[PDB]
Amino acid sequence: ATRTLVTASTPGADMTPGQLDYTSRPLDVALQQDGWLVVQAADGAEGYTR
Amino acid sequence: DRLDAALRFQQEALNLRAQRQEILAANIANADTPGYQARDIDFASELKKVMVRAVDLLYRVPDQPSLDGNTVDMDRERTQFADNSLKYQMGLTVLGSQLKGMMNVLQ
Numbered sequence: 001a002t003r004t005l006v007t008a009s010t011p012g013a014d015m016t017p018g019q020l021d022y023t024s025r026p027l028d029v030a031l032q033q034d035g036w037l038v039v040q041a042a043d044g045a046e047g048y049t050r
Numbered sequence: 051d052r053l054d055a056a057l058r059f060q061q062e063a064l065n066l067r068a069q070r071q072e073i074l075a076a077n078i079a080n081a082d083t084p085g086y087q088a089r090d091i092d093f094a095s096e097l098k099k100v101m102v103r104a105v106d107l108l109y110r111v112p113d114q115p116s117l118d119g120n121t122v123d124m125d126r127e128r129t130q131f132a133d134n135s136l137k138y139q140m141g142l143t144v145l146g147s148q149l150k151g152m153m154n155v156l157q
Contacts, residue, residue: 002114 053152060145062100066093067138069105074131077122084118088127 020030031037036048070091077088088110096105112121 003116005117 057145057148059101060141060148063097064138064141064145066091066097066100066105067134067141071131071134071138073107074127074134078124078127078131081120081122081124081127084120086120086122088112088122090130 015034017031017033029037031050036050038046039049041047070093073089073091077086077090080086089107090110091105091107110121113123113126
C-alpha cells in the first residue's frame with residue numbers, strides 16, 4: 001500500500017476573540033470570551049452569533 | 051495423424067499465442083476503466099492440456115492499489131505484450147521452417 005491520496009479538510013473554527021473598537025453607539029455590544037448572542041434563524045431554529 | 055499431428059502441435063501453440071495476444075490487447079485497451087480486473091491465461095498449462103485435448107482465464111494479482119479499482123499495470127502489460135509478440139514470431143518461424151523443409155523434401 002504505497003499510494004496515499006490527500007484531501008483538504010477544515011475543522012470547526014478558531015474562537016479567539018477579535019479586537020474591538022469603541023464607537024460609543026448606545027446599543028452596540030461585545031461578548032465575553034465565550035459569549036454568544038442567540039438569534040432566530042430563517043428556518044426558525046435558534047442560532048448563535050457574535 | 052502423422053503429418054497432421056506433427057504440424058498440429060505447433061499450430062495449437064500458435065493459436066494459443068494468438069488468443070493470449072487477444073486477451074493482452076483487450077486488457078491493455080481497457081486499462082483506464084474503474085472496476086476492471088486484469089486477466090491472463092497460464093500459457094504452459096493451457097498448452098499442455100490442449101496438446102492432449104474455451105480457455106480458463108484467471109485474474110492477475112495487483113501490485114499497488116488504486117482507488118477506482120483498476121488492477122491493470124501498463125508497464126507489466128507492455129512487457130508481457132512484447133514477450134508474447136516475440137514468442138508468436140518465433141513459433142511462426144519454426145512452423146514455416148518445418149513446412150518449407152517438408153515441401154523441399156518432395157523436390
